[model samples]
Structure formats: C-alpha cells, structure tokens
Target: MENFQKVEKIGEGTYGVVYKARNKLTGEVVALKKIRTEGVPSTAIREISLLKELNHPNIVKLLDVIHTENKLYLVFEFLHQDLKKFMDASALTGIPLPLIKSYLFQLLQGLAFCHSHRVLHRDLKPQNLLINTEGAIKLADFGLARAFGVPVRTYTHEVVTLWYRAPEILLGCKYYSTAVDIWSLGCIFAEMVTRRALFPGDSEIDQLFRIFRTLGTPDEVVWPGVTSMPDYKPSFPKWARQDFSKVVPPLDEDGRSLLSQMLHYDPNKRISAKAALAHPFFQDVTKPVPHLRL
Candidate 1:
C-alpha cells in the first residue's frame, strides 16, 4: 500500500523485490516484498501459511499482505542487513568466537521453534538470516519451507538451497525429517565461524566427496540403508582429519568443538537444534535483548 512510503529498494530475494518502507501510522520501518504474478499463484498461499504459524523472536515477523491486480505484496519487519552482508563488512577470515556463538545460539532457537511446530525451513543459510540494528538475528524466507509429518511422501529434492542442502536429499532419500534442517544448521554454523564454506562443491558429487574427506565415508552403520538411494555412488578417498588450524584459524577451543558437533556427516548423529542451543559456546551469550514485534 502507498500508505507506507517506499524509502529505497533493498536486496532482491529469490522470489521477489524487497523495499525499505516506512509505515505512516506507526512510524515504523518495514520491508515490503512484492512477488510477480508469474509461475505459481500457490506460492502466496505457501508464504502466508508458514509465516502466519511461525511466530518466534528469532524469526522474522510477517506484518501484512496486499494483493494488487498482477502482483502480490508481503510485508515483513525491516531488517537492516543479513548475516552474509554483515560478515562481508567485517572482512575477517573467522569471526570472534563470542559473536559466532551468539549467532549460532539465536539461529538454533529459531529453528527449534519451527521444528517443534512441524515446519522445516528447508533452506537455512547466512543470506536467509536477517540481523536488525539491535544485533538480534531472525530467520527469514519461508517460500521453500514445508510442513512435515507426511506419511511415506517424497518431497522435491530441489527444496533446500545448494550450500545448505542435506546429504539425504543429495542421495535422493525418500523419507527425511527435521534432520534436514539440522544439517543446514551445521553448514551455516561452519560458515559463520570459519568465514568459509565447509563443503565448497560445484556439484552434488563434489559436495558428497568434500563431506566424506572431512568426516569419513558413511557405511551402513552410520547411515542405515545408505547404498539404496537413487543417487548413491561410491567415492573412496582416505578420510582426512579436521584441521581447525587451517579452516578456522581464529576460532578458540569451545567454538571449534561446537562447530564440529553440528557438521557431523551422519544426519542421524547430527546434533538437534535444541541441544545445539545448549552448547557451551553460548555460556556467555547476551541476554534480555529487545522485544521485536510484528
């Protein structure tokens, strides 16, 4: 609505154009996401359903929705920058352990809330985590999110963004769980601390190999029935021990330990988001942050 002044164009997301807007009535800033009426109208239904149900301080707030003749606009809380942009500005190979720990704890808090409500944020990445002026983190972008607990159903393998996609999806596993999101959390956690992607693969095959080298190849014991998936292939390379000295040169002992736990190759063995929030990394996390409302 024109009632809110469009101050400037923000970043362009995968599905829409985001604009920085100021509400006339409340004098509050917001981000207005305008999606073109192309491809799928059901996308609007998808966004509305997930955002309406997913209410958490660590998650972005959906303020309102507006439908014009040809395009649909979804209004959301205006965040100043994303984790990616913030990291870029810092220009450090690795963030300080304290700051990385804080972000990771906040992220797990958001993901845990989503999983508890049967919603999975299939795509979890630094780009999708919005940070406000108060240094609060909020998970955003629910377009790829889906409600879980469907019986014997196979979701689109194309759901999660590549860098954060889980190994089950890579092998075309039919039945997955909240473990998919947890895997992505691990990926994001690694990237946040190291300031570098753990599995920087140009292809799915390369991605699998990268993981294998770091965490050792999986067998039936680690991931049961692993040989039967549609895209399963054997890549036999000697397992390489993790060297935090090179990857996360500045991360201290606690940070490395927490990051390693999350990046476990076996989805079954990966740390849950709730358990991750209780990690020692957050022992000194700042508390009593601001209350951000939708």
Candidate 2:
C-alpha cells in the first residue's frame, strides 16, 4: 500500500472517493478506494471478497487491498472512465455501430459469467460499466443495493436514475433472478446507439411507465403472473409498441431482434446471457476488436 502514491481524485460518490494513483516502484497506474476511518463498511469487504473470486476479462479486476489502522485502501485496475461519462463525452462524435456491438458482446460475456456462478448484479447502469481509453468495457460494483443507504426501488431523485432497472424490480415482483440483468443489458444496448436513454424516466413509477409506453403495458395475457406483483395495477394507461426502426435507426434486423428479446417483460421468456452471446448480431464482430478504427 505504501508503494503507491495518490495522484489525483477521479470520482466521488456515496461509495468513497476514488483516486487515480500510481505504483512508486513499478510506476503502473491504478485506482484507489480509500475507505473513511469510520470503519470499513461491510459492503466494501463483501465486494472485495466477491470480486476476488470472480475473474473475467470483462469484469473489473481488484488488484490489491491494503488495510491500515485508520483506513483501508482498495487497489483496483484503472480504467479511463465509466460508460456514463464516456457516453456524455462522446455524444458529439456519435459512437459507431460496430464498436457498440463489440462492447455489448463483451458486456454479455461478463454477465453470463456472473449468472453461471449465481451472482446477481441487481444494479446495472452506465455509471457502473467501466471502460478504458482503448474502448474496452468491464462490469463493476456488485451487490451493494441493500447497503447503499437507499432502497433499490425508491422514488428519491438521489436514486441514480433507474433507467436501466428491470421492470420486475420496479413492479415489486417477489421473483427476480438472472432475467433482471438481461433487461438492464437491453437498455444499455439501446443507449449505446442513441447516446441517450431509451427510457429516461423522472421517477420509479415514470420509469416503468416509460418502458410500458414504448413496449405497451403488460397484463396476465402478455406476462403471466404479472398482476400478482405487489406493485402491479391493472388500471393503467394502455399503450402500443413503438416502431423500432425510428428508435435505433442504425441497428440491423438481427441487432434489433436481440434487443427485443433482452427486453422481454416475462422473466422466464427473456433471453439468457448465454443465449444472447450466440445471437447473430455478434457473428461478424471478429478478431482484434481494437482494429475497429474508432
């Protein structure tokens, strides 16, 4: 831990301020999470242990951990910035379709790894999707919703924009598993093309309505057992599915089809991460993704 020197603060949030640091000996760049002296939150320890066990190229790697008397410094692989900021910055350039396709494929690969191990990344959003300057992306921040100091399905604006949140959670379903991640993946898939949220809702309720507005409201006929959801209400606005061509104009039929499957309302019917990997959307995204002259 003492071998590293703090360079500058990069990001600040409820989860300790992250700092860009470097190794004094090897001169290698790294990110540091300095937990406050108020006692290392169990969430930090829990996340560390989980990350140590799960290893994948598309999942952010935790390089090292140093616990001092007063503070704990979590050493992590330094990615340039997360997808949220990357998208915000690249909104002007317009992300190319192939790059988005490759990134989505890598994203699903990581999700497939987690789902196979019975790990749930209940929260999936652009902010948690880290990327390096080379355009490589990785998944981070796992299983902290309960310890995040706010309910996952809250209406508070402080709630990190539930745009990518799956409908099952929003509707208070007692059942949720790997299907939730697929829905969030679908939302991210669309955002990659538009550089804007497909369902940019102001609140939890509005978020659900936004999804319903685009895909049309669901019922027992469309989604069996949906009415049994704790937050389900039959008396709501009835809308119809919007045209996909106008929404993501550049996406080909196969890409749009995969997006539709990932966004299925019924958890059981939604495509699994493993199955998504086999979709033809990524068939042509071949060797050395870095060669894509973005």
Candidate 3:
C-alpha cells in the first residue's frame, strides 16, 4: 500500500471509495479502494480474505491491504473501465458475438472458481464485471457475497440487484446453491447479446411474472417444494412457453437454448457454470483465454 500514490477518486463502491493510483515500484496504474469503517465492518475484510485466497484469471486480483488511521485500504490491479462503461463506449461497436461469448466464458470460469470454494457472489451484474483495456473480464465487488456450505442460516433477503437476481431468491428461498450465480449469468449473457436487460420489471412479483410469461409457469411438478419458500405464491395468469425468438430477440438458436437452461425457474434444475462453459454455443469459438488485467 505504501508503494502506491493516490491520483484521483475513481468512484464510490458499496463499502468504499475507489481511487485511481500509480504504483511507485512498478510504475503501473492501479485502483486503491479505501474501505470506510463507519458503516462497513467485516464486509471489507471478508472480501479481502476471499480475494487473497481465491486465485483465478477471471477474478479481480487483490494486490495488498493497508490498515491505517483505523481505515482499511485495498489495492487492486488497474482496469480502464467496467462493463457498464465498456457498453457505453462500445455500444456502436455492437459487442461482437465472439467477444460476448468470450466474456461469458470468462465470467463462468470466475464464478465456477468461487463456487468450488463455496463462495456465493450475491451481487453479480454488468457493473460488477470489470473490463480492462484488453477486453478481459474481471469479477468485482464481493461485499455482499458470502461463503455458503454450512447448515441453514437466515440472511437478509435483500441481496443481488433486481435485474440480475434469480427467481428462487425473489420467491424467498433461503437455502440456495451456486444456481443463484447461474441465474445471474443467464441475465448477463442475455444482456451481452442484446445490449439490454432481459427481465426488466417494476416489482419483485412483476419480475417473476416477466420470467414466467416467457418460460411458462412453474408448478410443483415443474419445481418441487417451491411453494415452501417464504415468498412463494402464484400471481400470474399462467401461460405456455413463449418463443425464444421473441424473448431474447438477438441470439441465434444455440444461444437462446443455452440461455434457457441457465435461466431455469427451478434453481435445482438450472445449468451449472461448468456445463455452460462446455455448451455447444462456445464449441466453434477459438479465442485463447487471456489473463485478467485487473
């Protein structure tokens, strides 16, 4: 931490303010995150611990942590921008199909590593995925994320952002698995292909209905024990499956099919990240895996 010099305030994150900095030693640019101790307690520490132990090319690298003046500072590799910024700049570029597929594969690889370590990245969205100058994807923000392999525990239902959140979460399922991340990946994949959100709803119920309307309603037969969730209820006028051609709009048949499996209403039935990586959609893509820059 001492070898870096803060240059400017980049942005305010969930637990801290991000600073653009220059490393005095290597002369490389970096992002210095100063975690405020007032409202954030163990969140920053937990994130650092997880980032430090988890080593993957798709995940953001935590260079070091500095504890000074009763405040914690986290140093991360520098990235020119995040996915949101990339979208804004490259919107006209139309996000090449192969590039989007590459991003999705990288995202899945990162999430797969996290899941293998029993970590849940509760918050996953375009904004959380950072893109460096090289266009490599990096998963960021583990403040709201948690490691879950233990027994039952009651956590606040408020987790992921609404757009990227899973259906089981909206239905108030407390005990979930890595499927939660897979659901967000589905949304992310759709957004990457179409350059827009997949499920844009006004409310939680509205969100569920939006998903159900496209995929068709899920009954006990389709999703056993779904009714046992705390927020479970049937509100929509159940309908049959809608055409994926109309739903995703931009994706081809294979892309639509892969997205459908990842976005399954039944969390238990959702495709795993590993499986998605091996899907036929990515079979023809031959880009070499690039190391994450930030």
Candidate 4:
C-alpha cells in the first residue's frame, strides 16, 4: 500500500470515515474510506470483495485496498458529490430533461455491465450515485451488491433499500434478476425529473400500497404468481393505474415509455439494461455538454 495525504475529512458513514486525499505518487485526488471497526462490518466486507471485480466508467472505481491492525481502507476515485446532494442543490427547478437523460444513460450503462457480470446492485438509490464537475455520473456504494445466479435464485425478501425497492420484493418474492435494478432505475428516473420521491412510504406494507396506487394493482393476468407470494393478501386495495404523464408531467413521451417498461410488476417482463440503452429516450441524450451547469 502507498501513502495518501489526507486533505480533510469529507464525510462519515456509520461504518467508516471518508476523507478527501491526494495520492503521493500520482498527485491524484481520491477518497480514502476507513472502516475502523475492531471487528469488520459486512458492508465493508461486501464492498471490498465486489468493487474489486467491477470495471466500468459509470461505476465508481475502487483503486486500492489496505488493512492495518485495526482499520480497513478502501480507496476510490473521488467525485464532487452524490446525486442526492446534486439534485438537492438544483432543486429550484430540478435537473433538466436532457441532463436527466444523460445521467440515466450513464446509470444504465453501468447497470448493464453489472448485470452482464451477474453482480446485482440490490440497493440502488440516488445517494448511492456519485457525480463530478464534468457532468459524469458513477454508481457508488456496493455494500449491498451480490453476485446473483443467472436468471433466478432464492434470496432474502429484505434485500432492497426502501423507496427504490421493487414490487416483487415487497410482496416477499425471493426470485429475481437484473429486473429489480430496472425497477430502481424507474424510481430514480422519475425522481431526477420531479426532484421528489416516486413512492414515499413509512412502512413495507405502505410502500406496496403507494406503488399499487401509481402503477395499478396487479392480478394474475399481470403478474402470474401474484396471489400466492408470502406477503400477498387477497384483500389488498385495488387501485387503477394512474397516467405517468400526469404524475410526472415534466417527463416526455420517450421517457414515459421507458419508465413504464421499467416499472412493470412482472420481473420477467421488465426491460433489460441493454435494451433500455438502445431506447429512443437516450437517442438525443448522446453525451453530456462540456460546460454544463445544473
């Protein structure tokens, strides 16, 4: 391991301390996240193992790893801020549609890479994304990332982070693929334009209801295994689908089409990351502007 000069302490998660530092050899700025547990945390364990194998421009790069007597340092390429803070700073009018498309394109690109490699980012959210001054976005935080089976596998029902959680997971289903990430993409896509949550709920059950209200309640015709999942209730409220154009008025036709596909209740029918990149929504999203401002 090499020495990095700590510029300042930039952030702190419950499990570690984040610092803005400069690499002595390259003089390059980097993030030094130190997990100081006398006993290692699983978050640190998963990220250490997962990020090492993932390689994509849109996915945050883990440059190096080091462990001393009582600390574990995971070195990462530094970015200006996370998408959550960036969106908040631009909350006056929310991110412009074209920029949102550009950002979405980057996210999907990274997601496609992950899916292709069978690494599922089970907990994707705005706060987990990093953005730099150059307008490039990278998916960060692989603490919950998992190496998944090809098309199906038995997994824990509680794998997701709320708000961006998928419908199938909410109903206690254990089988999924890259489709779960697509569901989160839809959630993030809507939030980027509106600067508000697509589904804001206080509890797991409440979260499902919120989703049902917006996307329409599902039945056997829509999701084949609907009524038999562990958490499925026959007496749940039946709500009709609300138009996406009305709910997210700022989004256009192409975006609406892609978002709707991503939000599909049935995992098997949800759009794949590769297909989504080839979507018309990102046709004009080609690239980020050189001197763009939020």
Candidate 5:
C-alpha cells in the first residue's frame, strides 16, 4: 500500500471505488480499484479470473492485485476517459465517421477475442469502454462477464443494459450466447453515428416495443422457439423493418448491412464479432494506405 501514492478518486465501479494512483517506485500512473471484502463479491472474482486469462491490445490490462486488511486492490493501466464522457462532451457536434469506424472496429476486435475464448461480456455500453489520449479504445468493466461453453447452460436474461440489450434477451431467452454482445455493439455503433441512443425506452416493455417498432416484431418464423420463451409476449404491435440508412444517416451501404445483421431479432442470425471484423465496412479502415505517387 505504501508503494503507491493515491492521486484522486475516479469514480465508483461495479463492486468498488476506482482511484487514479501513481507507483512511487516506478513513477507510473495506474488505476487502483479497491474492493471491500464483506463476503467476497462475485463481480470482483469474475473480473479477476477472466482478466487474468484474457490478454489483448483492445482489452484493459489488469497489472497486479494486492490484499491487505479487508480490502482487495486491483491495479490496472490508466485510461484518460470513457466513451460516454467523450460522447457527451461532443454531443453538440457528432463524432466523425472515420473515428466512429475506428472505435467500432476496435470494439469488435476485443469482443472477437472474448468470444473466441468462450467468454461472454454480458454488459457492454459506452460507459464501460475506456479510451486513452492516443484514441485507442479498450473494453473494461468485466463484472457482468462470464464464461459460456456449456451448450445446456441457462443464463439470466436480466444482464445487459436495457437500451443496448438484444431482443432475444429482452424476450427472456435463457440459453443466449455471444449474439447478445453483438446486439449491444450494434446499438453502440448506431449511437456513435447519431450521437444519441437508438432506443431510449422508459421500461422493459417499452424497450421491447421500441425495438419492435424499429426492427419489426419477431415471430416463430424468424426466430424458432421464440414464442416458447419464459417472458414471450404475443401482443406486441406489428412494425415493418426500418431503413438502416435513415436510422444511421452517416453509415455507408456496407456499414448499414453489418449493423442490420448485428441487430437481428433472432440471436442465431445475428453477426458474430469475428465475422463482423471481416465485413466490407472495415475493409478500407483495416487495409494499409498506399503511398503518394509523386
């Protein structure tokens, strides 16, 4: 504890208070998260276990852990700001399209890595994505994340944030997979393009209807066994499919296609992060630029 100097309180996290600190010996800035050990929070345990196994440039790095007294301190690489803060600050004028593409691409890359490792980031939103001064974005806040390799495992439907949640999850599907994260990414992608939330519902019912009104209500035809879900509602107002270009005005054809696929009502039809990374929308951004012919 004496080896590091506490700088300032950043904010409250899922299971602890996060702090900006400096290592006295190495003089390196880092984020110090202090979790109280009342009974050992599952969030802290899940975050520690998953982060220890997952290592990627787009994922936040957990540097070290310290146990003293009744508190556990998790040291991590310091990031300047979060995506929500950045978006709010730039709300008057929307973020540029190129920057949006880059950010979304990085997000998908991180998600791809997690999905490949049989991990599910159940909660994904702008507030959980951290960005540094160099414009590099990394996925953070893994309190709601968990590994999902068992085919028969049933997960809680009340996981992701309401606005960014997938329709299948909203309908109370228990055996969901990586498609939920892809849906949240689709919402984030649209938010980046418009500088506003796509579906800002006041309640769970409203959230489902908002999505239905935009993407049309799903049926057994589109989503097999959807009617058998625990919370399935058959009385939703029928809505036709909306034009993606109008919803995301700044998006190109390829971008619209990818977003539409990610936002599919059927979880099985939703695009995977790994497959999304290879989409045409990211072709130019991922490719090397040619030198000027003088």
Candidate 6:
C-alpha cells in the first residue's frame, strides 16, 4: 500500500473497496481492489486464478498482487469508465453505430480468447465491461468465471444475471457452456443500439417472459429437451415472435441477423464469439482504428 498513493475511491463490491491509485515509482495509474483476509471469498480466489491465466488486449490487466497482515490488494490497469456508465450518459441519444460495432467487436474478440482458453465468464454484463479514453473495451470482474472442459462437470445454473442469462440457464440447465457469455453479448448489443435494456425484468420469471415476449416462447421445437429442464414451466402465455428490426430499429439487417443468432434459445445453436467476429455486420468495422489502442 505504501508504494502507491490513493487518488479516490472508485468502486465498492462484496469483496471490498476499489481505489484509483498512482504508483510512486513509475507514476502509472492503476485500480487497487482491496480484499479482506477474513476467510477469503471464493470470488477472490476465482478472480485471481482466472486473471493470472488470461492475457489479451480486451481483457483487463492484473498488474500485481500484494498481501498485507489482514488485507489483499489486486492491482489492475486503470480504465476510465465502464460500459454501463458510458451508455447511461448517452441515454438521450443512443451510441453511434460505428462505436457500437467497435465496442461489440472488441468484446467478442476478448470473449473468443477466453472461450479458446476454456474459460467461462459466467457473469458478463455492461457493468463488467470497461472502456478507456482511447475507445478500448476490456472485460473485467472475473469473480464469477470458471475454467471448463476436460473432465466435464455440472456447474450451477445460477451464474449470470437474469437480464443477460441464456434461456437454458434460466430453465435450470446444469450443463452449460461458453454460449452463456455469448447470450450476454447479445443482450448488451441490443442495449447499446437502443440505449435501454433489451430485457429488464424485475424477477427471474419476469426475465424469462421478457425474453420470450421478444423472441416468442421456446419449446421442444426451438429448444429440444427444454421441457425436461428442472425448472422448466409451461404456464406462460404464448407470445408471437416480434420482429427483430422493430425491437432495435437502429440496427441494420446484418446487425439484426447477427444479434438473432446470438440470442438463440438453444445454447448449442448460439453463434460462437469467434464466428460472430466474422459476421458480415462487422465486415467494415473489423479493421483497426487509430482511436482504439488495440
């Protein structure tokens, strides 16, 4: 703690406080997350382990770790703001299409890297995505991330936030995959275009219905074996599929097509992050831009 000077309190979470700090020696700005030592939280352990293995331009950099008598600090490269704040600020006028494409592209690229490494970022939302002045978007908050594959294990379905959670997960599917994160990206993509949440449900059931109302109710036809899920219920009123273009009027055909594929009810059918990067919607936006640090 002595090596860095605190600038201000940046954030607070279940773990502890996060502060903007400056390195005394190199004068580099950073985010210092202080974690309590009292029976170290599982999120802290998971975040530390997963971040140590991840290295990508779109992923937040964990600069260093320091352990004191009763506290642990994780130092990270400072980011100017998060996607939620950025979007909220532009509530009156939606984000520019080019900027939206750039941000989503970077998000998919980072997610592709994570999936390639067999890591599942169970919790991915606008709040967890950080952006800088140079327009670089990075994935942060890996506390809910977990390494998947190999032995094949059953993970809890209560992972992602309700709004961005995949239908399969909401239906209590214990066996999920990287597609979960892709689902979140889809919700975020819509939000970016509309400057409002695609599905802002007050409860878990409401969340499910919100998604169903937009895409129509999922069944064995669209999502095979969906009825077999532990939490599956067939009581909701039928909803005819809404036009994707109408939902997000700002998105063009290509954008709507890509988003449709990402928000598929079947996790197996959802477009992979790597494949999404190649989607025609991003053809012009994929090239490097001078403004983006990446």
Q: Model 5, 156-234: lDDT tens per residue? A: 2223357887787778777779999999989998998888899987777899999988887788888888788889867
Highest lDDT against the true fold, candidate: 6
Cα lDDT tens digits, model 3, 1-294, are: 577788988876656578899988899888888754245456646655867787888888888888888677878887766887666666665677888888888898899899888777876878778876565788886644343221222222323247877888778777768999899888888887777788877777888888888778777888898777788765547778787788777688889889989988788789988888889999876554333334
Q: Which residue pairs does candidate 2 place in steric collision?
A: none
Runs with alpha carbons beyond 4 Å of true place in candidate 4: 1-9, 12-15, 23-27, 36-50, 145-161, 290-294
lDDT of 3: 0.76
lDDT of 4: 0.80
Ranking under lDDT, best-scoring first?
Answer: 6, 2, 4, 5, 3, 1
Write down the TM-score of every candidate. 0.80, 0.85, 0.83, 0.84, 0.84, 0.85
RMSD of 2: 3.5
Task: Give the clashing pairs for model 5.
Answer: none
Give one digit per residue, the lDDT tens place, for model 6 in 1-294: 889999999866435678999999999999998865255456656656767778999999888878777788889988888888878887777677888999999999999999998777777888889988767899986645243211212222223346887877778777789999999999999999988899998777999999999999988899888888989877867898998778988679999999999999988899999999999999889433223222
**Tens-digit lDDT string for candidate 4 (1-294):** 357898989766424678889989889999888865245566646656766878898999988888786777888888878888878887886777778888899999999998898777777888778887777899876644332211221122222347988988889877667898899988998988888899987778889999999889999999998899889999999999887787777678888899988998999999999999999888787566423343
Q: Rate the local accuracy (lDDT) of all candidates.
A: 0.72, 0.80, 0.76, 0.80, 0.79, 0.81
Q: Answer with 4 or 6, whichever has the higher TM-score.
A: 6
When superposed on Cα atoms, how far off is each prediction in RMSD? 5.5, 3.5, 4.9, 5.2, 6.2, 5.2
Q: Where is model 1 poorest over a 10-residue stretch in terms of lDDT?
A: 148-157
Error of 1 at 267 (Å): 2.4
